[PDB]
Each structure stands twice: as structure tokens, then as C-alpha cells.
């Protein structure tokens, strides 16, 4: 026996579940619920329950004693976690976490909102079925890579998770929205060529008419990763373009959406859109819990900002305390500064094993163009008229022609922003100044204010919502 | 007095000087008994050519510690620690006014000399609270501060500084105040900022006592160079040459004054000569940052800045001649500054004319508003989404 297994794991999940499911059907309380979900719920379940009085523990005892015996693959994943008929990939505790002895201790006691497993054996007497199935499923998916379970368990939360909530009401989608997310962090980890897509797509369209924006958001993230595994650029390209991404979905999930988006776009040479997403991504992530995702994002981030024609700051590589891993990324930045090929090419190969692991390697090949490109734009911007011969020596280019061709690709895009005048052989910068005797600044400011404006109406509106949800909630 | 050790320990560290420099650095610990502090200072550097011992690294520095030095190092460190133990013990039992205050004091010149943090953290704090001759307290707090700088630990140094701050106005001795300015300044450089350090430094030049400090000649040269990194040409130039500083000192400024003078004169030709001489003499003897970039970079823009202010157009031919540095080198030096946004001129090299954008009217400002705006807006768009959810 262990009294910690029973009291902590069953109670903690109980409070949380009841309050969200009940609140969500009743009224749109959504801002308040999202704040609870990411920070508190995930941390408490993960960290402290591992070392109790028994081996491991997320919350698999609320999926064992307010299970309700649903048609869901909550029970299916449970059997593996304990022992009911199969031991699975993880052994049972006989310190009163047993599934081999069901109907052991319960501290929760009756209350229908609270959930209770011996009160009722099926929830199929009401529209409650999809949300309570989603809720238990949620608890399960987080734990599965954590306790090093593999094989069957991961695949029956990729296709079958989709089956459980596809017919839904607003409330039901909102509980399920979470369930899909905690599935997404395991999903990035193992790559499959297996096509999970069908169910995911078909459920996306029906739910949008049903209501709930949050459910829509999470499925878009999951789906980007599905393309990533396959490593087919085309299919992912369709998905990013079509979507704009709304703002109702938690902060942790947004960071995952931005990282994935940023990564794929940059290969094409769309460094410009991708940099914006990645910079937002880093910042969006949580504190200490986030740290493992944050480092991978920090590797990609230097590369996407470097791709633009910027040379990122050296302190940034230094400061997170992954400095060591960051050390090749800094070297790539230095190679871009000098304009020398020779350092850039040798680094790319040596550190290539480390880059492939991050996923950055595909972008890193495109960076060769930047080494010379950043150098010529820096020099031309600073001093407008310089001879073609002078740029060739600095970068270690072949010829004055070799430089002119860099300028030719760039000009149409606008990067270098200069022109080649072969009247004597120089590059001449477009630049002039005295914009305040022209109407052009009023425009610059005009867009900035329009952009700000839609956000201002949003600021007032959103602000009031969470204290009001709390005042509506009953408190002791 | 123990301050003399940091400046010498700077000398092997900096890139204008290296190997010979350890023999001189070694001589000071035998003499003072600063031996524990020197041993401690090797760890603080974490290898930038340091550690002259026969104990280890005999030919790596190509200088070594002596046998008498070793026995004396041990003797001195142990005696101080040994006294400390008994005084800490005997002191508690008797009077709190008299006994403890005296006991800690007796230790204290010696305790800083060794630089031993652990014995210091308890002993030092007790003395201050109980009032006596007010000048005395101030002096003592200064020894506590010296220990923390040696390690380059951020935490220990900040902790130390705070007790002095409370005490200094209390005594009100302006001579003693001037000491607190030097310690803060060393620490300010230590993180990075010469800019902070500079402000403190300028004040210290007025009234000076060479007790707990090295020497007055060393400090004045430091103050003018550090002031310069922070301050622009008009005010600093007028103070050093036209004011008191070179006449009283009786010449030790010539390297730094030459460097400022060229800007004033509008003969850049002297500026470029002055750079090498100031770099080695004045700037680089420093444990706390022998980092030329702040000094060098700030001065190079100040030289260009006045030339840009004075004319809308110039020739290259004039620029190249005035500086005396070559046409290519002047372009190269500029490439960083324009791109960073310290300056805003261009050189149309192939035709040999330079156009300068002026710093006057709304226009220069409009360019500026936008720069602050883009980053602000970028931070804003991220903030709007995160708070909302």
C-alpha cells in the first residue's frame, strides 16, 4: 500500500476536470480555464508524482477510478500502464495503484460533475459522452513517451483519438481541444510514414460548423508535423497558406504552431515570413518546463534570422547555458560576417551531425548564399559607390562578374538593394534621404496605427473576461 | 595597497603584453604578503597566461615561484586564519561594544591581504553597527569590499558594496568617499560597463588619498581614458588640457591628451598616432576588462562625428589626407559604424566625393522614430497574443 498513490492522483485530476467541463457547457469561461491548464496541471502531474511511494505516476489512477468504463482508448492505454489482462510496457504497482484489483480505494466520493467510476458504467445516456472520453484520453497520452512505452500505444492515439470526438458540441470540442495537444508533443517525437491524416482532416471540417475555434487550432499543429515526418514540402505548403490561425487556444500550443511553421517556410527561401514566427515562438514558450523544446527552437532561430541578411547577436548564443551546442551556430554567424566561404563550408560538415539532430540542417545548406550576400549589402549600404573589384577581394569571390550576379538575383527581391553600373564598373546604391517634404511618412505611420487598432478593441475586450469568470465562479 | 596586485595581474592578461609580465606580477606578493590573493587571482583569470610556480607550469610562463615565497605564503595565510578563529571565539563572551569591534579590526588589514572570503563574511559585518570614530568605520568597510573584487564573483561584490553605501554619508568624510568611487568603478568595468564606471571615476580625480589605493599617477591616467569612452570631445578635452590636470601632475597624461587634442584642432593626423600609445599604456594593464572595443570604437566614431557635423559634402581626398590612414582602411572602419547606426554618412568612392546626412530638423528624427518603433511594434504583436490567451 501507499496512501500517496490514491489520495493525490485521484483528487488533483478531479477538481480540475469537473470545474472545466461543467463551466464550459454553462458559459464561455475559456480564458480562465487555459491559464489553469498549461502551468498548474501539467507541472504537478509530471514532476512530483514520479517520486512518491511507488514507481512513476502521472495521473493514471483517475483513468482507473473515475474511468466510467467508456468506449474510448483511455481504458486500452490504461491496461498497459497497469495490468488488467496484459502487463504492457510498464509494470503495475501493488502499492494501491492496481488495475488487477479494480474497485480499490477512492477518496472522491459521489458527485456526478466530479466523475465517479462505480456510480455508472456507461456515459451513453446523454451528450456528455465525447467530453469525458476526451478528458480521460488526455491524461493518458502525455505519460506514454514519458515512461518509455512504445509500439501499439502511440498509434492508437493518432487514428483512434480522432474517432472519439468528431461529432461534438461547443463544450465537447473544448475539452477535446486539450486532448489533441498533449497528443501533439508525443507525435513530433516519433516519425511515421503511416497516414493518420484521413480522420484528422474529415473531423476538422465538421467541427468548424459545430462551434469551437480551439479544436481547430490544435489539429492544424498536429497535421504540420505529419507532413514533417513524410518530409514532403508540397503538402505542408498547402496547409500553411490556407490557415491564418486564430487566437483561442493556449500559449504553449501557439509556440508549437509558430516553430513548425517557421521551420518549413525558410527552405524555399522565405526567410522573411519565417523569422517573424520563430522570434514569436521563443518568446511564447513557458518557463522551466519548456526548456527542452526551447533549446531546439533557439538553434533554428539563429539560422532563420541569419538567412534574412541579418547577422544575429553573439550574446544570445552565449546566455541560455546551451552555449556549447550554440557554439557552431555562432561560428556560422561569424563566417557570414567575414564573407569567407572556406570557414562556412568546413563548419557545416563538422557540426553537420549535431545540426541534423536539431532538424536545422536543411536550412543550413541555404545559408551558403548568405555568407557572400550579407557582406556585399553591408558594404554597399555603408559606402554607396564602391568598385566591382573591391567587393570581389573582400568576400573571396571569383570575379567582378561573380559579385554582379549576386546583385542581380537580389535586386528584384530587394535585399542588397543596389544596382550595377558597368559604365566604369561600380555598384551604386539607390539610397537618398529627405522624406519629410513628401507625403510618404504619413503612410508609414498610417499602417502602423491601423495594425495597432484592431488589437486595441481586442485589448479592452479580453481584459475584463477573466476576472468576471472568477466572480461568476462560486468561491469559499 | 592590495589594489596594486590587480593592476599588475592585468599586465600578463592583456594582448599588448604577455610572457615577461609574470616575473613582475610575482614580486608584489612576497613583498606585501598578498600571496593568498595572487594564488586566488589565477583561478579568477581562468587561463589567459598566468600561474608562475615551480609547483606547476614551470616553463609555461617561463617564470616560477620561489621556495621562500612558498613557505611565506603558507605562513602568512595560516597565521591570519589562526588568529581569526580564536578572536571570533574570545570576542563573543566579553563586551559587545569594545571587544568584538577591536578583534575584527585587528584581523582586517591582514584578512583582506589574503583575500579569504569565508573568514571575512562573518567577521566583517559585526564591527560596523556600533558607533565609534566615524572615519574609522568607513576605512574598515573598504577592506571587506577588496576581497570580493579578487574573485570576480558578481554576487559577493554587490553584497559588499551595500554596507559601505549606508556608512559613507554617515561619516561624511569626503576623502573616504572618494575611495568607495574607485571600488564601484572597478566592479562596473568588470560586468562590461565603462560608461557607469566613468561617471564615478571623474569625481575621484579632485581629492585623492593614496592609502588603500595604488598611486595617484596611475589613477589620473585611468580617469581621463575611462571618461573619454563615456563623454564626447567638447567637455572632456576642455577639462584635461585647459584645466588643472596636466600642469599639477607634471606630465603623465600625454598619451590620452594627444588622442582628444586632434579632434579639437581638426587635425586627425595626430589622432591616428595617439591610438597605439594610449592602448598599451593607459587602457591595458587591467584585470577587470582589457577590452579595447568599447574604448576604440567610441573614439573612432567621435573623430568622424565632428567632421560630419561641420560639412554637408566633403571629398574623400580631404578625408584621407586629414586622418592620414588609407582610403581603404577609412572605408572599412566606417562600415561597422554606419551599419550599427552610430553614424550616417556614405563615401561614393569611385568618384571621390562623400555625401553626409545632417543631424538637424525633423527628418533625421523621423528616421529615428521609425527605428525604435519597429522593435517596439514587434514586441507588441507577441505581447497581444500571449496576454489574451
Amino acid at each position: 500500500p501507499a496512501p500517496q498513490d490514491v489520495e493525490m492522483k485521484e483528487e488533483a485530476a478531479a477538481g480540475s476536470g469537473s470545474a472545466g467541463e461543467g463551466d464550459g457547457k454553462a458559459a464561455a469561461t475559456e480564458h480562465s480555464q487555459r491559464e489553469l491548464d498549461t502551468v498548474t496541471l501539467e507541472d504537478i502531474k509530471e514532476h512530483v508524482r514520479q517520486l512518491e511511494k511507488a514507481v512513476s505516476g502521472k495521473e493514471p489512477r483517475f483513468v482507473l477510478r473515475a474511468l466510467r468504463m467508456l468506449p474510448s482508448t483511455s481504458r486500452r492505454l490504461n491496461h498497459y500502464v497497469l495490468y488488467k489482462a496484459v502487463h504492457g510496457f510498464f509494470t503495475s504497482n501493488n502499492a494501491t495503484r492496481d488495475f488487477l484489483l479494480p474497485f480499490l480505494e477512492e477518496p472522491m466520493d459521489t458527485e456526478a460533475d466530479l466523475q465517479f467510476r462505480p456510480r455508472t458504467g456507461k456515459a451513453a445516456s446523454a451528450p456528455l459522452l465525447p467530453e469525458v472520453e476526451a478528458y480521460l484520453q488526455l491524461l493518458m497520452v502525455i505519460f506514454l513517451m514519458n515512461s518509455k512505452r512504445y509500439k501499439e500505444a502511440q498509434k492508437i492515439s493518432d487514428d483512434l483519438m480522432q474517432k472519439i470526438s468528431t461529432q461534438n458540441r461547443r463544450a465537447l470540442d473544448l475539452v477535446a481541444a486539450k486532448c489533441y495537444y498533449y497528443h501533439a508533443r508525443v507525435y513530433e517525437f516519433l516519425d511515421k510514414l503511416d497516414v493518420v491524416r484521413s480522420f484528422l482532416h474529415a473531423r476538422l471540417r465538421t467541427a468548424t460548423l459545430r462551434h469551437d475555434a480551439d479544436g481547430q487550432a490544435t489539429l492544424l499543429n498536429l497535421l504540420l508535423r505529419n507532413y514533417l515526418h513524410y518530409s514532403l514540402y508540397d503538402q505542408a505548403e498547402k496547409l500553411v497558406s490556407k490557415s491564418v490561425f486564430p487566437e483561442q487556444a493556449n500559449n504553449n500550443e501557439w509556440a508549437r504552431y509558430l516553430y513548425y511553421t517557421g521551420r518549413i517556410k525558410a527552405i524555399q527561401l522565405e526567410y522573411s515570413e519565417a523569422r517573424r514566427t520563430m522570434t514569436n515562438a521563443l518568446r511564447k514558450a513557458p518557463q522551466h518546463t519548456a526548456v527542452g523544446f526551447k533549446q531546439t527552437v533557439h538553434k533554428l532561430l539563429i539560422v532563420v534570422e541569419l538567412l534574412l541578411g541579418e547577422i544575429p547577436d553573439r550574446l544570445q548564443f552565449r546566455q541560455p547555458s546551451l552555449k556549447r551546442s550554440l557554439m557552431p551556430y555562432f561560428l556560422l554567424t561569424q563566417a557570414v560576417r567575414t564573407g569567407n566561404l572556406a570557414k562556412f563550408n568546413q563548419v557545416l560538415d563538422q557540426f553537420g551531425e549535431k545540426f541534423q539532430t536539431d532538424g536545422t540542417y536543411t536550412l543550413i545548406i541555404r545559408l551558403r548564399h548568405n555568407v557572400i550576400k550579407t557582406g556585399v549589402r553591408m558594404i554597399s549600404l555603408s559606402y554607396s559607390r564602391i568598385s566591382l573589384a573591391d567587393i570581389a577581394q573582400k568576400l573571396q569571390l571569383d570575379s567582378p562578374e561573380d559579385a554582379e550576379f549576386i546583385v542581380a538575383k537580389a535586386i528584384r527581391d530587394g535585399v542588397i538593394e543596389a544596382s550595377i553600373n558597368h559604365e566604369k564598373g561600380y555598384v551604386q546604391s539607390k539610397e537618398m534621404i529627405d522624406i519629410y517634404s513628401t507625403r510618404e511618412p504619413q503612410l508609414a505611420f498610417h499602417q502602423r496605427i491601423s495594425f495597432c487598432l484592431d488589437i486595441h478593441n481586442m485589448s479592452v475586450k479580453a481584459m475584463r473576461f477573466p476576472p468576471k469568470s472568477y466572480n461568476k465562479d462560486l468561491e469559499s | 595597497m592590495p589594489l596594486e596586485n590587480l593592476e599588475e595581474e592585468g599586465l600578463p592578461k592583456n594582448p599588448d603584453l604577455r610572457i615577461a609580465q609574470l616575473r613582475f606580477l610575482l614580486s608584489l606578493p612576497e613583498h606585501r604578503g598578498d600571496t593568498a590573493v595572487r594564488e586566488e587571482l589565477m583561478a579568477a583569470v581562468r587561463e589567459n597566461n598566468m600561474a608562475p610556480y615551480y609547483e606547476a607550469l614551470c616553463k609555461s610562463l617561463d617564470w616560477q615561484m620561489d621556495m621562500d615565497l612558498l613557505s611565506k605564503m603558507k605562513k602568512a595565510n595560516e597565521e591570519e586564519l589562526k588568529r581569526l578563529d580564536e578572536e571570533l571565539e574570545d570576542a563573543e563572551k566579553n563586551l559587545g561594544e569594545s571587544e568584538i569591534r577591536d578583534a575584527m579590526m585587528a584581523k582586517a588589514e591582514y584578512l583582506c591581504q589574503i583575500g579569504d572570503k569565508e573568514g571575512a563574511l562573518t567577521a566583517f559585518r559585526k564591527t560596523y553597527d556600533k558607533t565609534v570614530a566615524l572615519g574609522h568605520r568607513l576605512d574598515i568597510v573598504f577592506y571587506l569590499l577588496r576581497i570580493g573584487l579578487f574573485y570576480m564573483d558578481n554576487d559577493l561584490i554587490t553584497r559588499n558594496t551595500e554596507k559601505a553605501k549606508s556608512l559613507i554619508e554617515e561619516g561624511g568624510d569626503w576623502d573616504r568617499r572618494n575611495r568607495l568611487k574607485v571600488y564601484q568603478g572597478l566592479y562596473c568595468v568588470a560586468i562590461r560597463d565603462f560608461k557607469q564606471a566613468a561617471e564615478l571615476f571623474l569625481d575621484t580625480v579632485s581629492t585623492f588619498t593614496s592609502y588603500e589605493l595604488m598611486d595617484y599617477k596611475t589613477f589620473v591616467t585611468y580617469t581621463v581614458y575611462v571618461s573619454m569612452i563615456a563623454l564626447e570631445r567638447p567637455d572632456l578635452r576642455e577639462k584635461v588640457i585647459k584645466g588643472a590636470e596636466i600642469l599639477e601632475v607634471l606630465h603623465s597624461l600625454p598619451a590620452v591628451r594627444q588622442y582628444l587634442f586632434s579632434l579639437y584642432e581638426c587635425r586627425y593626423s595626430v589622432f591616428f598616432q595617439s591610438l597605439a600609445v594610449v592602448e598599451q599604456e593607459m587602457k591595458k594593464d587591467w584585470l577587470f576588462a582589457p577590452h579595447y572595443r568599447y574604448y576604440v570604437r567610441e573614439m573612432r566614431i567621435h573623430a568622424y562625428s565632428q567632421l560630419l557635423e561641420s560639412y554637408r559634402s566633403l571629398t574623400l581626398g580631404y578625408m584621407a589626407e586629414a586622418f592620414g590612414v588609407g582610403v581603404e582602411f577609412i572605408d572599412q572602419e566606417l562600415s561597422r559604424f554606419i551599419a550599427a547606426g552610430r553614424l550616417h554618412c556614405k563615401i561614393d568612392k569611385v568618384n571621390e566625393i562623400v555625401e553626409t546626412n545632417r543631424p538637424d530638423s525633423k527628418n533625421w528624427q523621423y528616421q529615428e522614430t521609425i527605428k525604435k518603433g519597429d522593435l517596439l511594434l514587434n514586441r507588441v504583436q507577441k505581447l497581444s497574443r500571449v496576454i489574451n490567451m
Binding site: - | 593626423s269 579595447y292 589626407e321 588609407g326 561597422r336
Partner: peptide
């Protein structure tokens, strides 16, 4: 950006050479 001192040393030496010949 920053960490300029290293290159700076090289810049100074070469510059002197150019500085002697060219100067008025």
C-alpha cells in the same frame, strides 16, 4: 557587433603602415 579588440590589433598595425606613406 562587439568582441572587436582582437581584429582591432591587426587593424592598428596595418593602418600605421598605410598612415606613414600617405600622410600630409
Amino acid at each position: 557587433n562587439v568582441e572587436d579588440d582582437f581584429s582591432n590589433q591587426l587593424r592598428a598595425e596595418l593602418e600605421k603602415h598605410g598612415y606613414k606613406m600617405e600622410t600630409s
